[PDB]
């Protein structure tokens, strides 16, 4: 009994929406497995560290993501960036949830409205294999014509300067999982379901997709590895992207889980654990996706790189797909997508409750009053994701999936691993790790946060500022004026760390070397500044791994 809560609670915690949702799309638009490589190589070197470092920041500082600074108090600035891209991910994160409970409420009848045209939302142009050449992204399929018109309306709107109003459809299944999150959040701080569905659902996706007329194919091209294309940095920015949503690392949301843990709590084995389950569940997940999406290149006599969409919504094109193939669609259409359901709304309420638990143990105000505080962020929430089911909604989910993240989160962590290591000390914090959990972590683990994960870090955030694609989606090219909307996007929380560097340095009275060191010294050691003897200013602190 216990052994199994065990395992239950590391799978469940190794598992995450992004997993199923957003690699899928992401491997791809990427090549197949061109993007493996970046993606295991990163996913070692600068998750697996990154995401014991957040573990055990907040376990044994028993602070959300932005008080636990007060180790080193100029980089709350950082916390409070990681607070407000958590904010900003949510206002689409929950429109995919929107998404997933509309598929579910269509999925329960014995013709499913994605299996044939016909319908009043399909176009003249839509072809039934059972009843285009060049480059472009095949939308006249049944399942694409569904997804695109009878869920999306996006034949409606003719790109992010006509959005149009919201979908009275997509806003009752938004208030829907408004009310849930809400309800699940109110009074504080699922795995069965969680941990057994998304597994169970995989390997039955790759025993049926392994044998169909087209798997073979879809395979072979998984399988190829195009070097000319780990030499152009999106896929290396996109693998680091795709691994910090799936470790949520970057968000607040592994301190602030992390801050609840016991305090003899093993975090070694917690990174090691939910590393490898990301990895081989990623693996396995490209490997069905892309028989699948062979298959139906097979089927629609369209070659592999045109059947679907390289953007959101691939796995709304593709698990239908598959679904109606199987033996009894309804069954494993409605086991499928309550799947995604739950999967959704464990990631929501991590989200929102990172943010939650972050700006309360920063105010005691909105600690003393949890329910009100709830209910501000989610409809505040709400709202702006109501901005994003409009009929040119995916667009705007396009934008912000885009930009929210991404260079933003990758400075945010860069920022985090800089500071702890650096300033606050490498050999401080295994020393803090060693009195939690009894052991010293290892050299590679000191290297990795102090080094090397900073400066592949580093490589990235430049790369993706110098190597900038302008956005678009398919065949559909943003303004020029979405371009810049997005980088202010990420600004907005990237800026927050000079923004409170500077604030903190003019606040905090004394002279500069003064300023200084109570600007890096932590807040429990205040009365050192006074006697002066300061780490920082000592060549040994900088010069100990
Ligand atoms: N892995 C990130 C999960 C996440 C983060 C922030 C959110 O708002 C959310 O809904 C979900
Ligand atoms: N950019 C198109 C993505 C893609 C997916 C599969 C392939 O086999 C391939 O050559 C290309
Ligand atoms: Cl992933």
Same mark, same amino acid.
């Given at each position: ?181 809400? !309800?699940?959040?109110? +009074?504080?701080?699922? %795995? =069965? /379901?969680? #941990?057994?569905?998304?597994? $169970? ?25 195009? !070097?000319?294309?780990? +030499?152009?940095?999106? %896929? =290396? /920015?996109? #693998?680091?992207?795709?691994? $910090? ?301």
């Amino acid at each position: 009994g216990k052994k199994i809560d065990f395992l239950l609670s590391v799978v469940g915690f190794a598992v995450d929406l992004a997993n199923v949702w957003r690699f899928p799309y992401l491997c791809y638009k990427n090549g197949g497995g061109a993007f493996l490589i970046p993606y295991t190589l990163f996913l070692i070197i600068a998750g697996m560290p990154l995401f014991y470092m957040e573990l055990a920041l907040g376990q044994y500082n028993r602070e959300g993501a932005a008080t636990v600074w007060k180790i080193c108090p100029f980089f709350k600035g950082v916390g409070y960036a990681v607070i407000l891209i958590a904010l900003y991910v949510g206002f689409y994160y929950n429109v995919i949830i929107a998404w997933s409970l509309y598929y579910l409420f269509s999925s329960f009848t014995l013709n499913l409205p994605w299996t044939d045209c016909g319908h009043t939302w399909n176009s003249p142009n839509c072809t039934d294999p059972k009843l285009h050449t060049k480059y472009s992204k095949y939308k006249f399929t049944p399942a694409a014509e569904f997804y695109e018109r009878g869920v999306l309306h996006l034949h409606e709107s003719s790109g992010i300067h006509d959005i149009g109003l919201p979908q009275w459809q997509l806003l009752l299944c938004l208030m829907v999982v408004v009310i849930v999150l809400y !309800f699940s959040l109110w +009074k504080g701080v699922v %795995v =069965w /379901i969680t #941990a057994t569905l998304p597994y $169970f659902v995989l390997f039955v996706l790759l025993v049926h997709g392994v044998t169909l007329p087209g798997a073979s194919n879809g395979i072979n091209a998984y399988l190829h590895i195009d !070097f000319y294309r780990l +030499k152009e940095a999106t %896929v =290396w /920015i996109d #693998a680091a992207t795709q691994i $910090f949503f799936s470790l949520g690392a970057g968000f607040g949301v592994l301190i602030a889980f992390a801050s609840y843990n016991k305090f003899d709590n093993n975090c070694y084995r917690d990174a090691l654990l939910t590393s490898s389950i990301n990895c081989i569940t990623s693996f396995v997940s490209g490997f069905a996706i892309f028989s699948i999406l062979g298959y139906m290149a097979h089927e629609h006599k369209v070659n592999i790189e045109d059947v679907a969409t390289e953007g959101a919504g691939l796995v709304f094109i593709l698990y239908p797909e598959a679904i109606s193939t199987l033996s009894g669609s309804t069954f494993w259409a409605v086991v499928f997508f309550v799947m995604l359901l739950a999967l959704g709304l464990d990631s929501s309420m991590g989200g929102m409750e990172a943010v939650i638990t972050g700006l309360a143990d920063d105010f005691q105000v909105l600690k003393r009053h949890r329910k009100l505080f709830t209910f501000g962020v989610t409809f505040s929430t709400f709202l702006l994701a109501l901005f994003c089911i409009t009929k040119g909604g995916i667009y705007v989910l396009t934008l912000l999936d885009t930009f929210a993240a991404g260079t933003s989160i990758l400075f945010a962590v860069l920022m985090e691993a800089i500071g702890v290591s650096w300033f606050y000390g490498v050999d401080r914090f295994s020393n803090d790790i060693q009195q939690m959990m009894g052991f010293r972590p290892g050299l590679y683990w000191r290297l990795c946060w102090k080094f090397v994960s900073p400066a592949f870090l580093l490589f990235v955030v430049v790369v993706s500022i110098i190597n900038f694609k302008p956005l678009t989606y398919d065949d559909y090219i943003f303004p020029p004026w979405a371009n810049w909307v997005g980088w202010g996007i990420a600004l907005s929380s990237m800026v927050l760390v000079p923004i409170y560097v500077i604030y903190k340095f003019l606040s905090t009275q004394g002279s500069l070397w003064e300023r200084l060191a109570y600007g890096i010294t932590p807040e429990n050691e205040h009365h050192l500044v006074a006697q002066r003897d300061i780490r920082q200013f000592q060549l040994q602190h900088w010069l100990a791994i």
